[PDB]
Amino acid sequence: RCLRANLLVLLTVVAVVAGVALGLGVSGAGGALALGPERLSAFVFPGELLLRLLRMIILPLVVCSLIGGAASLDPGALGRLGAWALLFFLVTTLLASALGVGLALALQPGAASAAINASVGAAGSAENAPSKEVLDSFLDLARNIFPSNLVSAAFRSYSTTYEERNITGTRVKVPVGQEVEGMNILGLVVFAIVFGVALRKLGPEGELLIRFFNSFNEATMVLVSWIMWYAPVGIMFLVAGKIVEMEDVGLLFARLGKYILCCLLGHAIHGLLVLPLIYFLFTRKNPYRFLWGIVTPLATAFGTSSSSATLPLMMKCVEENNGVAKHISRFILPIGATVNMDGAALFQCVAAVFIAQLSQQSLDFVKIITILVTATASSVGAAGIPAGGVLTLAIILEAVNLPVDHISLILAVDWLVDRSCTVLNVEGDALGAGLLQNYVDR
Amino acid sequence: RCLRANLLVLLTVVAVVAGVALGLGVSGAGGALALGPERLSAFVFPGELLLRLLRMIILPLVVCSLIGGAASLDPGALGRLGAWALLFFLVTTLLASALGVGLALALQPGAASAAINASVGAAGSAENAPSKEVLDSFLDLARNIFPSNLVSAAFRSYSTTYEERNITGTRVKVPVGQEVEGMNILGLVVFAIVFGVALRKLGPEGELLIRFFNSFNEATMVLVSWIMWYAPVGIMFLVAGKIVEMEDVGLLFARLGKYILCCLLGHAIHGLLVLPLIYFLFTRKNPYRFLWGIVTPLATAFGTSSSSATLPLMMKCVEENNGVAKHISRFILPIGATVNMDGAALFQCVAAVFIAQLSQQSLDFVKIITILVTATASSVGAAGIPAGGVLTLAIILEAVNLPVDHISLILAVDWLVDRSCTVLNVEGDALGAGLLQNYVDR
Amino acid sequence: RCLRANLLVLLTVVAVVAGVALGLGVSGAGGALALGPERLSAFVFPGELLLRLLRMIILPLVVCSLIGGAASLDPGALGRLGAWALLFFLVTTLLASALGVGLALALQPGAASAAINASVGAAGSAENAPSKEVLDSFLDLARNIFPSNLVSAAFRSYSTTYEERNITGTRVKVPVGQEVEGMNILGLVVFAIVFGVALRKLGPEGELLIRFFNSFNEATMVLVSWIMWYAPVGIMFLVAGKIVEMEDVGLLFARLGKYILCCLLGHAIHGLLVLPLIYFLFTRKNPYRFLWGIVTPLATAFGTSSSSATLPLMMKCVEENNGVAKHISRFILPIGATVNMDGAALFQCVAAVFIAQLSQQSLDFVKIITILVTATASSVGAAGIPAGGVLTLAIILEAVNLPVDHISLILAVDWLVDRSCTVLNVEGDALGAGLLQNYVDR
Ligand SMILES: O=C(O[C@@H]1CN[C@H](C(=O)O)C1)c1ccc(-c2ccccc2)cc1
Ligand SMILES: O=C(O[C@@H]1CN[C@H](C(=O)O)C1)c1ccc(-c2ccccc2)cc1
Ligand SMILES: O=C(O[C@@H]1CN[C@H](C(=O)O)C1)c1ccc(-c2ccccc2)cc1
């Protein structure tokens, strides 16, 4: 039934296109001048509503899916599957970062152009920042792993601020911990996996609880169906709002065309050559057909710019349309979302290479390897914190000591490239799931 | 067994009467002068303890009751029942507001009297307020519906404050969102209903989870029995404390007797003529007998002045004493508490008409309809936020541009009329439940 | 199998000893000068990680264990068991406080010595404090009992701050309530017990839910096994960090040797004479053998200095190694942790007697009884709040009006005696559990 099957894909693609058209027409016809902030809020509000709906269920779906998936195969096979999955995610993120270096080095987006100016963008506010240390970031990562409280971890994460409690002499900023807002999805993932392993360690005592969590996840999936049918309206209004919130006639594109083209080309090459090649090599099944099977979550990622929001829609589409195993999907795809960020590592590395290319820095071999490794680790470093969309580039440049004086340049255009990043991240998650499904099948 | 059956009703009526007598005697014999703030806190503390007990269980009871009630009848009948229930609540709230107009217009409580003075009450602090816009209130309503996180929604709700982030020129206050304290019971209600519909959409997978939630609610009901047996002491001490906290020899009654009489008469006429007439018309069964069946929750509402607190006691009494169906009770009565506020719409409209009557405003037909509709919507507008006992009148007067210069007059006497409001709200909820029980039975 | 059975006990004792050796060697070899704050954080971080792990599971384990234990015996036997348990905890805490008086009165640690000076310790900051009233502390106790919301009670507790809302004349600080951080484990304990009683009041409706909670607790116990195998590393690094954070060559020991010896001797006499004597008297079974059965939780308490953290390890060890009944363990040991603080009452009383002994106060009989009773009540007074490690001594001295001018003396050495306090608290909990197991068996 092609007409009914492809209806959703048609609807969300039409939603994205019509949202772009609506926003461009509104901005050209007057935009904010004809709109006002109140009508801007009402115009963006369906987007905020879709993101409120899809952030409501990631906690049930992630927790109960991992508990229902971990306790479906014995811990030996689970350990092997988790290890090969982490290896796959690490390799894909690393290949993405290397592709970013190879593109930004060649196209040279940091050539002398309008982007050389940074007074308007920075205006002295770029240097002023928390300036989180790399060690403190890794410690906050390993403290959001193994949370102090599960309930608080359902909406809070640990962030190490810096006070000035060294008045005795030579004032040095010292770390203090204070829980902030944002889900600790990494901690919940680890707790859930460990729980499911515990229930598989038990036998008849755990059958009730596995039945509970599988039923709960199936109910949440039934909610996901209806959220999915709502999603095109939210995507349309969200995209229209996010191109009405800033003019996009071509001024910022004319400013940073090489950098944005480098990022989008890197994302497409990662998402249409590298990972499809890996899938074909391993499972020997049409990767582009599989990619067409998941267009609706990809479009939702492009609209939403959060891997959080698109994941329920994705797990529904992968388990339903494509012939991916239910337990493998449950175990892998949440872990893919919180760890694999191929696009994030990609455009972080490309941004670093761009800001280094302007001012003519060297970056011969050692600094290249450094940016690769710290981008690969920051794939998960940025994962626990939702606020740090591109904030993690500052700590990278602190590690390797580059000019952070114009990091605010990307914040004007962060809303664009992060979308394609989200697309590639969910794509890499699904391709890992398919590969590991075939590996477990063999 | 009349002696054992009516014991609780006798006990709570005696508690209210003895609390009034205790507070009046203490205030006459010296009150605070003989008491001190520390003994005032210890004297009110049983009231605070009862409200802490009854706010502990509304979350379990509401969530699990709606999940156990929604998934007891098919979604078609559920949709019809929900639609006729919302229509009933809307019509009752609208009739209440019209009754408020009809009374305040006739009795004319805003005649020239001591209430004309407002310097002592306002003293310039009335105008200073957040001044929340109507659109922003509706957006916060639809964002507390569809919460971002369920756990946070168990004790937090979304409130749009206003910052001054327009330093570029012509400083205009802009909205920012920041979650505040207070349960998001509307969001939990909607999520729970949707969940129960999902479990009914499933079949054998959901039987476990329905059995879980029904068992959990029955356990919470068993707690409610013991809280109910404690409740008269809390009501007595609470009422005594709330008339010791301000002198009530008759000064404020002598000031606002017409307004308070108008509100209480409106509440009684709504609760003893209109809704009993509707019940008799539809189900043809003794409405005043049914009203006598539920005296203990009504007295608890009068003491507590929160529809939150009285609801567990009410659902216990309605399912136990009166012959109302268990599933219909579960589905309707929580939704009644968070949506139907007949008394709130009533005294909000009466307060508006009173403040308009002083200063001799017109309010011919269009403004009357405006106050009716905005009161009907603010019945649920004030529902998500517990702090806004009468705060929502300011945004109404912002919509229709009346003198808010003396809104602080009612805050001295808000503690009185809100009690009768709570009584009428729970009464309207039960009468809707009985009507819809008979409709489903037919 | 002695070699495999005693492996854990060997490992944690070796961990404590090696942590002491590591910290002393690091402090002697340069300590902070060779370390830096960043490496100090990385060196303490395994300790923080163990405490994050053991605070993650106390909520599941406490809640589900009490629900699974309360609903295993009928409410009559439960009421008797709870009453005899509270009587036992009260008597043991009182005996501990009397032992503290008897030791501090005899050894006279407040003799004229270096400890007479307090300018360096206090420096005027001792008097400045919240100065919480005793009545307000008891009210906050009874409001953390019977929480307003269960979810918030999973990570928040009620603390009455004091504002200055008496500008009308004679500015007097007035209480305001605002929820703060810290688990409301007392409220969760009471709610859980009451819930389990409700499920036992029900019959077939509750069997599912009891099976759920028992399965959930068993899963959490399975997590506890792995946390237990990790624990020695955390204990070693934590102890090393907490003796590297301050020099302990003997300066503070040379300052307060009599006071610390009094506290440790009181703890050992309570833990090795009084309670073993009671156990032998009642159950007639080797108490020191039972004490050897639980060495690993005692060492964990000595390392961690929190009865929160050690309790999962303790309930595992008591149910597994020693022949204590599962239901009795579940019901008693959590209640022991949140109520019985023998060591806390002990060193609080000893600290009071020490600060009274310096400056030559009388403390004949009435003040002795006062300190005993307020210490016995503050055993649970300090229990709800984790921040108040020794903060509760100030409100005691407010009750009985002693010099609080040098309360900051103990804060330098609070990290030492609180460890032995935690050891004795968990020890008293287990001994109560064993006694009541034998009583129920008889
Ligand atoms: O902050 C993030 O990363 C940046 C945000 N936009 C870019 C993108 O989403 O690709 C990169 C982030 C967002 C979402 C989740 C997530 C949460 C719950 C379940 C599953 C996933 C993790 C990390
Ligand atoms: O703020 C409110 O409305 C005013 C407060 N006092 C008046 C009254 O209670 O009638 C009007 C409010 C209070 C309570 C709940 C509620 C919460 C949970 C379950 C069920 C109900 C909704 C809204
Ligand atoms: O603040 C406390 O008491 C002082 C802290 N250090 C000393 C000690 O732990 O002995 C005394 C405290 C700590 C922990 C818990 C606890 C929490 C959850 C489950 C079980 C228990 C109660 C109260």
Residue numbers in the entry:
A (entry chain B), B (entry chain A), C (entry chain C): 47 to 488
Quote the paper.
Multiple structures of human SLC1 members and their prokaryotic homologs, combined with biophysical data, have demonstrated that these transporters operate using an elevator transport mechanism. In this mechanism, the transport domain with bound substrate moves perpendicularly to the membrane, while the static scaffold domain remains in place and constitutes the trimeric subunit interface. Subsequently, the inward-open structure of hASCT2 indicates that the transporter works using a single gate mechanism, in which hairpin loop 2 (HP2) controls access to the substrate binding site on both the intracellular and extracellular sides of the membrane.
We determined the structure of hASCT2, reconstituted into lipid nanodiscs and in the presence of the inhibitor Lc-BPE, at 3.4 Å resolution using single-particle cryo-EM. The protein adopts a single symmetrical state with all three protomers in the same outward-facing conformation, in which Lc-BPE precludes HP2 from closing. Building Lc-BPE along both of these cryo-EM densities resulted in two binding modes, with the ligand occupying either an “up” or a “down” orientation. Here, Lc-BPE is located in a space between HP1 and TM2, thereby occupying an uncharacterized subpocket in the substrate binding site, which we refer to as pocket C. Additional rounds of cryo-EM model refinement were guided by a closer inspection of the cryo-EM density as well as by a detailed comparison of the initial fitted cryo-EM model with the ligand docked homology model and other available SLC1 structures. Indeed, the refined cryo-EM structure for the ligand-down ligand binding conformation obtained an improved enrichment score (AUC of 84.6 and logAUC 44.9 compared to AUC 69.5 and logAUC 32.4), supporting the remodeling. In general, ligand-up Lc-BPE is coordinated by binding site residues S353 and D464, while ligand-down Lc-BPE is coordinated by S353, D464, and N471. Further analysis of the two potential binding modes showed that the ligand-down state has more favorable hydrophobic interaction at the base of pocket A compared to the ligand-up state. The cis configuration of Lc-BPE allowed the compound to make key interactions with residues in HP1 (S353) and with residues in TM8 simultaneously, a key feature of ASCT2-ligand binding, while facilitating hydrophobic interactions in pocket A via the linker region. We identified the ligand-down state as the key pharmacological state that allowed us to explore distinct chemical spaces around Lc-BPE and improve its affinity and selectivity for ASCT2 (e.g., ERA-9 and ERA-11).
